[model samples]
Target: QYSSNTQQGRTSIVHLFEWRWVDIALECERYLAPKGFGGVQVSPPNENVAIHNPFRPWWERYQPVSYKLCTRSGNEDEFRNMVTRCNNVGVRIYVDAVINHMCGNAVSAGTSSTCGSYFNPGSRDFPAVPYSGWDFNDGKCKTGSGDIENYNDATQVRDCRLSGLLDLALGKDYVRSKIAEYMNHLIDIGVAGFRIDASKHMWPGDIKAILDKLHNLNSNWFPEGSKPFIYQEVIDLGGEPIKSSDYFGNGRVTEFKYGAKLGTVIRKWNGEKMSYLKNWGEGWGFMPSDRALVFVDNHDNQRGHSILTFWDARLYKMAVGFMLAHPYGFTRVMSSYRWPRYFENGKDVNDWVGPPNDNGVTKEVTINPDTTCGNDWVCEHRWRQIRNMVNFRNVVDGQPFTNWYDNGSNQVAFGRGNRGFIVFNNDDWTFSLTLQTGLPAGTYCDVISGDKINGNCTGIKIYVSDDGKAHFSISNSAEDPFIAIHAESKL
Candidate 1:
């Protein structure tokens, strides 16, 4: 369940938020495979309610209507095709499973245009899944109004509604089977794994039960006896009653604390309070490597959340570069569409009006190769630094950090198992230093910037000698600032 099963020996995953299934499939073949990204964490693939009041915001996907594999993204058939195509290209697909709760209370006006069946808490009228008022655990909730208000009460947090959504009782065998059936369907279709959404609101024991029933990955797409990888989203900022450790035995938990720590270090570095890579992972407590999914930013945080350090292009790139080069937990990169400064109102400029139609039934959306996406969608994964870092990570796999060197709170340098070397200068001036680079005497590419034709890197050159030391210099200017060299680059 932990392995990504990457193609061509790569080791990183990207979250392509809000992209259509067909676009994702095409991206895997055209870009991700060549760039060395291991897999993609796609948007929620289940059926969800369409909330027009907020102008069809991104959070609408969080409000589910049913378990049918139909949503704004695409239908079940398009989903299967995406998985098959991506798997064939060595890029795996991970479904973002939103199983925490159902839609919130809809006003009488909003309810009239509801496309799917509804599950009203006041009336317990969910006809699509055939769930009734008796199915919800209202009596078990500890809140006076039957809402989840106390974080310390495990029962109330897990059994009651989260942010006014409908909560399902997983204690019933029927409910467990239904959730398992939905997951197993994806497993059979060749998806690599899942990102359990709002998992902090679900009981760990119930999650374990649902995982127990999930069948192994289909042998046609994966090795026999392979289990689908599971990463539960448990945002434990400390002091929460439901700690992340409870779900460790089930699968990896999203380590939100790592992002906070990385953001802090990035802030300190950019502010000139510390060296480029100093004081990293010091104050923050993170789960052990095997039980954690680490990242610098995610879909929720890039929109000016407390978890993100800065959205500035230069700082964001450096922070992500440091995270990729550092030895840490299993990592995932956030890919997002653009949004305004006050982006939390749920208005997304990149939201698709409807799924692509073939003859009558909706098919997959077609990719416009020449179209410039002019909306709130900020596709960071397509950036030069992020993409090159993905390639660098793959080329330096299994290589531990060696030959660490830093210059008095301004610059830093290190090697990755001797397969790669990186240097950064956050000072207001340039850096000229002679360092020991344990590589063969030849020319190599500086992955940071040299030339990138199409999507492939035409990396910079670094010459190593018999004595294993090279003279390097970098100037802190607005245009270019960092230098990196990998084994695959030519002089």
Candidate 2:
């Protein structure tokens, strides 16, 4: 379940948030497949409540109405077309499976919408999946108010309603079977894996049982007898009652702290004393390499929740560059949609309000010939530094960190064994450091700033000599403050 099972040489996952199934199909053929991207994490492909008053929040998709495989993304046929097209291109699909609970019942604000089935939320009835009071976490919820009031209380955190939405008792046999059935349906449809939404809200045993019932990936994409690539969404930022490690048995846990720490370190990269990079992975209390799903920013945390995003501009890209260059957990990039131009810190932060919507309807996404999203999508994956680093990441696979060097502050350089080398200058001025890149003596193209053109380095060039030494110079004030060159990028 931990393995992504992407065909060799592709090791990155992009969350194509809110992209329609038809668009996703085109994306696979036109771009993702050709770029060596492993898999795409699609939004929930289930029916959701039809909200009108508040229009529709991006989170409405989180509140699934049914597992009918029909929603804003597309109907069953379109989704199937996407799966087949993407799988054929060597890019697998991972669904954001919403099994935690159903829509919020009656709120004070009067946003009560009936369930998609013949059941009523007020009556605690749902006949579509055939769930009732006995199937939900009833008053036994120890939160006192029947809602999550205490993060310190594990029972409440895992059993009670989150935001007044009814919680499911996955501990029940029927609920487990219903969830399993939905997942098995996706597996049968040719998806390679799933991201269990709000997995922390469900018991580990419950999730394991559901996964156990899931059939193997369709042989069309995966080899026979291969388990689905599963990763759970457990947001543990430390000092929390429910630990992320609790769910590692199910699969990998999304290391939310990875981006948090990176955001903190990137801004201070050139600080007076910067040694945090000395030991980044396990030393900084991060999860084991294979057991963690890492990212620079995600759909949820990017909403001005104090995390790095496109609004951070050069700093955010710098963090991504470092993340791709450094050998860490499986990477999932956030290809987000434009947000409402709300001002944060006296600056107009891009739309984090909702997906690209005007008059309560999400517009159809169109791709420009320049390879950018038209309907307000932030395609960070297409950024030159990020796109090239994806290839750099593949080239440096199976290599260990060596030749670590720094200028006491700001500037740092390291090598991926003898296969790759990278330098970062987060300072305001150019850094000229004598770095001992473990690569063989050769002239190489800097993949970050630009690639090689026929026989010449496109942007910034790098040269490593007989002793594998180079005076690496990168301007901190440049468009990108990073320089990366791998063995395969040699001139």
Candidate 3:
């Protein structure tokens, strides 16, 4: 089975990172489906320790209190409603399950009803799931202090606590049962699959066992007996002992290298310098296309990593543009909130200062008709290059480049089996070219800067002669210097 349960021809996923359940439902109906987006990777749905610090940094979603689907995003009813509503609109929901570890916060008093289970770390106890010290990895955590001190050691990576959180002994049948039961519940609730957080820290065998025991997706949204799609988070950046390839059977591992490389290539894209992408997959130190889940930036990396994020909007969209056009891995887009300017440690710094808050209450994501967002939501997917590229991926699904052209270290242009064609310009000056687009002779609108308005090209007018080649020129103009067109966007 493929790594994603997305329907045929539905080729891309949008990580609605930290968007609320109700807002996601609205997004599915109002935006994603119409944009041809395959599905959404929603925030972790299970209960988590409500972090009050750092104004509730987005990472709080990664901390678990219990498997109960009551989180800062929504309650069980709202989550289920989102799944159903999104599914109704042909958008699938993949949960970010934080099963590798529970939150580090120890419950100081009595247990909670709405907050679910409580953990008493003083005694190494989790009263909600009733797990105790024995259910954790106390002995195998070879690190001196139980933290992952050595990324080069497989044993230490899997057994030690990540960020000093409670590392569950997934190897134990009981621990496996708890995880499986929680996943199965989500399966029964119509989720198409999961994003196993911290999968790199879990042994491959242990993950496989948990996945095998999970039930099929609910018949309401998926095929009978269909395997729940899985994509694991394995941040392998070469030299690390645990390669993304190590987690193959667990699901498609996140090919972080793709983003890192793309960021580098795009920033210096001198049309002709991108030939390294001619053999894109394993050559770029990434897992096979089908086995890799790729994106430009994710929730965690945008805050600290140099990879393209909303902050680098121009190059960011350019990188995503190239990513969508290139036939490589299963592409995922990040829809995030603004990490607006804030002072930290008495200095102006912009880290993941968390989503827009009304005194720590997460504000809803709002989209403007002009294709921007409000309430500090950096809806990257809404960008013309980003969202329009969804149609590009869809139109060119399963197709490979038939014609290729480039400029020395400045641009890359090619056609995807005559189905879609794109050109990028990173040159400092206006660029002009008449190259082989390999698309059927026709006039098409550039979906990057502006799409077809009703029936006319709103931006650049690309003319492909009867020979499937065209004379294209990028002004490196007022808008981002990129042009993309496909069968679906043709005038």
Candidate 4:
């Protein structure tokens, strides 16, 4: 379950948040596969409650109405086609599985779900999946409000409802079987794995029981006995009774602290500095490298938390570049859509707005002449700096991290053995220095600034001397305050 199931030589996944299945398939063939992206973590593909009053908010997808593979993204056929196409191109698909709970109890019981499935949130009944009130945790919860009220109590956090969403009794054999059945269906559809949504609200043991019932990956697309990759969403930042480590026995757990700390450091907040990132991984109190799923900002936090997002283009690119260049946990880049962000007082009043749609139909992801996405899609994955760095990770895969250098502040430089080297200038002044890059003597292309095409660099070039050292110059005022070079970039 821990295996990413990505093709050999590929290394990172990109979360195509709220993207349609057809769009995702096209992306795999047109961009992802060619750029060497390992896989894509697609949005939840199952049926969810349909909210119209709030104008189809994005959170509605987090509230599962049934296990039926139908939603704004596409139907079951479209989803299957997406998986098949993506997998065929060596780009795997990891589904965002919302299994922790059903639609919020506050929602009216109706057939207005994405798939028109009959569901009664008030009665705790979903006829589509045939789950009844007995399948819920109403009797198991001890919280007075029946919702998770305290982070200090692990039991309540697991058994109680999450924001009034009907919590499932995962401990029940029937519930586990149903959840596993839904997942197995996805596996048979050629999906590589899953990102278990609201995993923090479910017990670790219950999750294991359900996962055990999942069948091995389909033999047609995967090896015999191959298990699906499992990455649980557990937001443990500290002082919480439930630690992300508790779920390590299951698979990789989302390391929330990674983005929280990185954001502060990148923003230079609280006197944080880039030099402190020398020991980037486990040394910084993060989970083990192999057991973590890291990202700069996710679909949730980009709007909720103060983490770096596409809006912060300069800093976001630098942060993402640093993440890709460093040897850390399994990386997942975020590809997002833009929404009307109206901050009233201190909060974005329009944060709940969903994807750009006309009469509730999601707009197609149109590509611009420059390879950037249109129709309000941010497509950070398509940005030259981000896309090139995605390839940078693949080029330096398996190489040791060495040649670490920093100016004791926002300026830093490092290399991945002799395969790649990167420099960052986040300080107020320009970063000009000769450093030991630990790479072979050659002229290399700085991937961040531009690309190397037809044996010519379209951007800045670095010359490495015989001693495996290179001179790097990065201006703080530069559009991208970083530069990266790899073995493949050598001329």
Winning candidate number (lDDT): 4
Worst 10 residues of 1 by lDDT: 352-361
lDDT of 3 by residue, 278-366 (tens): 66677766788889898988888777645788888888888888889988889999988876657675543656476787876779987
What is the TM-score (0 to 1) of candidate 3? 0.94
Weakest lDDT window of 10 consecutive positions for candidate 4: 468-477
- lDDT for each residue of candidate 4 in 1-491, tens digit (9 for 90 to 100): 88999998889999998999999999999999999999999989999999987989999999999999999999999999999999999999999999999989999988989999988889999989989999999999998999989988999999999999999999999999999999999999998899999999998999999998998998888888899999999999888888999999999999999999999999999999999999999999999999999999999999975699999999999999999988899999999999989888789999999998999999999999999999999999999999999999999998988989998989998999889999999999989999999999999999988789999999999999999888888888899989999999998
Colliding pairs, model 2:
270-410, 339-351, 339-352, 340-351
Which parts of model 1 are misplaced by more than 4 Å? 106-121, 269-284, 306-310, 343-376, 451-459
The TM-score values for the models, in the order shown, are 0.88, 0.94, 0.94, 0.99
For model 2, the run of ten residues with the poorest summed lDDT: 107-116
Give the distance in Å from residue 344's predicted Cα in candidate 2 to where it truly belongs: 7.3
lDDT of candidate 2 vs native? 0.82
Better of 1 and 3 by lDDT: 3
lDDT of all predictions, in order shown?
A: 0.73, 0.82, 0.81, 0.93
Which stretches in model 2 have alpha-carbon errors above 4 Å?
A: 107-119, 269-274, 344-352
Tens digits of lDDT, candidate 1, 20-75 = 78878888888888778889998888777776664566777787667778776778
Q: How much does each candidate deviate from the true structure in C-alpha RMSD?
A: 4.2, 2.6, 2.4, 0.8
lDDT computed for candidate 3: 0.81
